[PDB]
Amino acid sequence: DLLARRYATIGPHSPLFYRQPLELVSGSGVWLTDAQGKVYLDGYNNVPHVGHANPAVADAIYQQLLTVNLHTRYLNSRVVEYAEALLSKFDGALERLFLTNSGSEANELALRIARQHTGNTGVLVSDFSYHGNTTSLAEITTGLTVHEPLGAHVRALRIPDVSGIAEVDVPVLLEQSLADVDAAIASLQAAGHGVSVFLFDPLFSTEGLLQLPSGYIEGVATRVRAAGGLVISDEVQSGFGRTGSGMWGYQMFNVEPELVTMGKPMGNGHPIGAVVTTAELLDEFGRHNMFFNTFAGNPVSSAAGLAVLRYMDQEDLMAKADQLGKYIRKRLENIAQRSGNVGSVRGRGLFFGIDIIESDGSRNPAPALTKILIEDMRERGVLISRVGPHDNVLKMRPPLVFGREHADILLGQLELSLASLP
Amino acid sequence: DLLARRYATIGPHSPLFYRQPLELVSGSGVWLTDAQGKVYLDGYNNVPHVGHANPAVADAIYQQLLTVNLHTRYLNSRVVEYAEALLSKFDGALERLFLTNSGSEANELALRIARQHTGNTGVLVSDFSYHGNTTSLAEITTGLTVHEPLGAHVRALRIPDVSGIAEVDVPVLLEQSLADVDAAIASLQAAGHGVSVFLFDPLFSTEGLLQLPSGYIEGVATRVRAAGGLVISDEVQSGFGRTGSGMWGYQMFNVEPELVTMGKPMGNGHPIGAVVTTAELLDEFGRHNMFFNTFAGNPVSSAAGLAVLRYMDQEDLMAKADQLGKYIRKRLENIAQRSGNVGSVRGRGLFFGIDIIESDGSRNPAPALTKILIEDMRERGVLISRVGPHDNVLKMRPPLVFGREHADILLGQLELSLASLPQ
Ligand SMILES: *Cc1c(COP(=O)(O)O)cnc(C)c1O
Numbered sequence: 061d062l063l064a065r066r067y068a069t070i071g072p073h074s075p076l077f078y079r080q081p082l083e084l085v086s087g088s089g090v091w092l093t094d095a096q097g098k099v100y101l102d103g104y105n106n107v108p109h110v111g112h113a114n115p116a117v118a119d120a121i122y123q124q125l126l127t128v129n130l131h132t133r134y135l136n137s138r139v140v141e142y143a144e145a146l147l148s149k150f151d152g153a154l155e156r157l158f159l160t161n162s163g164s165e166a167n168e169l170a171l172r173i174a175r176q177h178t179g180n181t182g183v184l185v186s187d188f189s190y191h192g193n194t195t196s197l198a199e200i201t202t203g204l205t206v207h208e209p210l211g212a213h214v215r216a217l218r219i220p221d222v223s224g225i226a227e228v229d230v231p232v233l234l235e236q237s238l239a240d241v242d243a244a245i246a247s248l249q250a251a252g253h254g255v256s257v258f259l260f261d262p263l264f265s266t267e268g269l270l271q272l273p274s275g276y277i278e279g280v281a282t283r284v285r286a287a288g289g290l291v292i293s294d295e296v297q298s299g300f301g302r303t304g305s306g307m308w309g310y311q312m313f314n315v316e317p318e319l320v321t322m323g324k325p326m327g328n329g330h331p332i333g334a335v336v337t338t339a340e341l342l343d344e345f346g347r348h349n350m351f352f353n354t355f356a357g358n359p360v361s362s363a364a365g366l367a368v369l370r371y372m373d374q375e376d377l378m379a380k381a382d383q384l385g386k387y388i389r390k391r392l393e394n395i396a397q398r399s400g401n402v403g404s405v406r407g408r409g410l411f412f413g414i415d416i417i418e419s420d421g422s423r424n425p426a427p428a429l430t431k432i433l434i435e436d437m438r439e440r441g442v443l444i445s446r447v448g449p450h451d452n453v454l455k456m457r458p459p460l461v462f463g464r465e466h467a468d469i470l471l472g473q474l475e476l477s478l479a480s481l482p
Numbered sequence: 483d484l485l486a487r488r489y490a491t492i493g494p495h496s497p498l499f500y501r502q503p504l505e506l507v508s509g510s511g512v513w514l515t516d517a518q519g520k521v522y523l524d525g526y527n528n529v530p531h532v533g534h535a536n537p538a539v540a541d542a543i544y545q546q547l548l549t550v551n552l553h554t555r556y557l558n559s560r561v562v563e564y565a566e567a568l569l570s571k572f573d574g575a576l577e578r579l580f581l582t583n584s585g586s587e588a589n590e591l592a593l594r595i596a597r598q599h600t601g602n603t604g605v606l607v608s609d610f611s612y613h614g615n616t617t618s619l620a621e622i623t624t625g626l627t628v629h630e631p632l633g634a635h636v637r638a639l640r641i642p643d644v645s646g647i648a649e650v651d652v653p654v655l656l657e658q659s660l661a662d663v664d665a666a667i668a669s670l671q672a673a674g675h676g677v678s679v680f681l682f683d684p685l686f687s688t689e690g691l692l693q694l695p696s697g698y699i700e701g702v703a704t705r706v707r708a709a710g711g712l713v714i715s716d717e718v719q720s721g722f723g724r725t726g727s728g729m730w731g732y733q734m735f736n737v738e739p740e741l742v743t744m745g746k747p748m749g750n751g752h753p754i755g756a757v758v759t760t761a762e763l764l765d766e767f768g769r770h771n772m773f774f775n776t777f778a779g780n781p782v783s784s785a786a787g788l789a790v791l792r793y794m795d796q797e798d799l800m801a802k803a804d805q806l807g808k809y810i811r812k813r814l815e816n817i818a819q820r821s822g823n824v825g826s827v828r829g830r831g832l833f834f835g836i837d838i839i840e841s842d843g844s845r846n847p848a849p850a851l852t853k854i855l856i857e858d859m860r861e862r863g864v865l866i867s868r869v870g871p872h873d874n875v876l877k878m879r880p881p882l883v884f885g886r887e888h889a890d891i892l893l894g895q896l897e898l899s900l901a902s903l904p905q
């Protein structure tokens with residue numbers, strides 16, 4: 061029995077989705093098949109950015125595996141080709157790269173570059189976030205359970221959300237949120253840490269897909285820079301065109317970060333991450349450290365990353381996601397008008413969510429109804445999930461090859477699922 | 483244009499070998515070809531454990547890539563099959579696994595498990611070691627340049643080496659080295675760190691390929707456990723049958739570590755690492771943390787690691803490395819007797835080295851002569867490197883598919899190169 065064999069090797073704690081674990085044995089594009097032969101529409105996975113079993117990615121890997129696959133202490137063209145392609149997707153002073161093998165490795169390295177450059181240790185993060193699984197990341201984690209107490213060098217911020225707030229009240233929410241930033245900064249200075257970084261997910265997805273007031277990110281950047289710190293945009297959830305309106309999530313705001321980190325989608329499932337930064341910051345850190353990552357930038361990893369960028373450009377996926385997101389938003393707003401169990405509609409491009417609420421007039425978060433909806437949608441052949449501190453934001457985030465025919469399948473089942481609640 | 487295009491993107495500090503960097507465009511087995519068409523014998527690379535362009539590994543990866551490639555929050559058989567195969571290579575209480583994507587990820591996680599389990603933060607490492615590139619690892623690094631000052635929670639040990647010492651002086655060396663361990667432990671305790679771990683490469687390769695007196699590792703383990711700490715064997719250099727005499731380098735000592743880390747060879751070049759541990763340790767850490775690594779244990783990484791183990795088993799590579807290492811050692815002992823520029827013969831299996839020295843009677847380390855030999859061997863069609871705090875231990879560590887014919891090519895060029903040094 062597979063579950064028992066898993067528990068005897070990797071253990072019973074490593075997480076599994078659903079009340080009954082699901083065994084997935086094959087996939088193609090947006091479609092997955094279980095060990096019983098049931099077929100599902102993927103409304104969840106972002107690692108297969110260009111679709112399950114994409115054959116252009118598979119072929120690029122295979123052909124390089126039959127050539128050579130050594131570390132970067134020997135010259136080889138593939139890593140340079142990939143670095144050129146990836147950096148062509150950045151403007152401004154973001155013109156150099158460190159490659160890694162995961163998003164956690166990228167965020168660990170970005171915090172290390174910042175601590176050395178600033179001479180400060182303080183970290184500003186959201187109060188319900190997750191950026192990876194190393195010791196330095198565990199000490200700043202607020203959105204998942206870790207044994208490490210929150211570090212004395214960390215201040216957690218309540219990131220503002222305008223969802224459901226009267227427009228007249230927005231400027232005061234912005235003002236109070238920026239005063240909380242000044243107070244965090246002043247506390248870190250008084251206690252001798254100073255300010256090293258502000259680190260954020262531009263979609264604020266773990267937090268419940270927040271809609272920020274205009275001027276908050278710009279305001280935080282100005283205050284952090286007056287204090288001698290840097291801004292890191294973690295693009296693991298929001299990058300590679302997921303938002304539709306730009307390649308990188310930070311482009312939704314009036315900010316150009318000094319450091320950008322990435323992972324998940326980048327190699328369609330191959331282990332790849334990166335830190336994109338300025339010439340000054342890369343040169344300084346290399347003068348000061350004999351830094352080397354053995355697997356980073358090998359020719360096969362580089363072939364995989366090049367095939368992902370080439371495929372997304374040839375198939376126009378970012379522009380498609382921008383157009384389709386406009387359609388999905390209209391459909392979800394109609395659904396919210398018709399269901400007493402739906403609150404705000406959140407997100408853009410191919411990252412959407414809806415708040416699930418009691419229909420008794422309270423508008424209280426309904427996490428038990430949300431779990432019903434996730435399990436019912438699985439029975440109906442659709443894989444979705446949830447996010448947020450009240451466990452009630454129903455999330456829709458498929459591979460970036462998801463089209464209008466797929467949107468109509470997902471949205472039709474979701475309507476039937478909502479209609480079946482009490 | 484390639485070198486300049488590199489420096490404009492990933493920068494001019496990321497390291498390159500040789501005075502003139504080499505552009506390697508293809509390989510097969512132990513052989514590599516440069517952009518000018520020159521062919522070289524690989525006496526250096528351990529990442530392509532089963533040889534360059536190995537087709538069984540390539541086929542296994544590609545077939546899984548046509549099937550599915552999702553994280554471990556859905557059940558899938560390939561990760562379980564690989565975990566069973568890897569854990570069958572271990573004995574005793576080493577019966578659970580955390581997968582990762584790199585050796586640094588593995589050693590970061592092992593230090594984290596240990597700090598939470600012990601309630602202590604103190605680290606014992608050698609005084610010329612390297613275990614990876616995270617913040618927590620930089621703070622303990624002694625064998626490579628980093629900006630971080632050595633952490634106050636760290637004590638660096640001078641690991642004893644019997645190479646070239648009279649047998650009658652070995653017991654005093656062991657007694658004095660264990661007293662240094664007693665002192666380091668007491669110092670950690672007085673400062674309020676306590677002892678969390680002793681972390682070591684069993685080959686002590688970065689340190690210059692040391693030959694330890696019997697009882698040193700075992701003595702360190704007893705003292706660390708009495709202090710409430712754990713032992714971590716870093717198998718990135720010594721694992722997967724590199725030493726010939728066992729699957730894991732720790733087996734050269736009479737010790738069973740609580741935690742074993744690995745990387746480099748394990749996927750032939752695919753990004754894979756692991757921490758192997760006990761049931762008690764894995765269960766404790768998962769009860770206390772919602773631990774998850776998104777790429778770890780995906781089906782394609784699992785296919786790669788299963789193909790490496792299957793190939794090394796089918797081709798009998800560990801046993802072949804044990805027999806071939808015995809033959810290389812005899813040849814290198816003959817070379818050392820005859821050359822006034824060679825000191826001791828070091829290593830075993832397919833990880834060997836020799837110490838390059840002046841022939842003026844001083845026996846002083848000769849780093850500049852070592853560099854001459856490395857460049858000369860390149861010109862002769864052989865890739866080798868060096869290690870150690872004096873930059874004078876010539877290092878040879880080929881793919882594990884390297885055989886007797888290849889050994890004779892390498893060793894014959896090495897003798898001719900040695901003979902060309904000034905008198
Ligand atoms: C998944 C994730 C990470 C960690 O990536 P890993 O590859 O599991 O190390 C970091 N940041 C964000 C926002 C993530 O979603």
Ligand SMILES: *Cc1c(COP(=O)(O)O)cnc(C)c1O
Pocket residue numbers: 352353354355584585586587589612613614615683716717718719745746
């Ligand atoms: C290379 C190496 C590491 C780090 O491995 P990466 O895969 O580069 O993180 C750790 N320990 C030892 C002994 C190594 O040789």
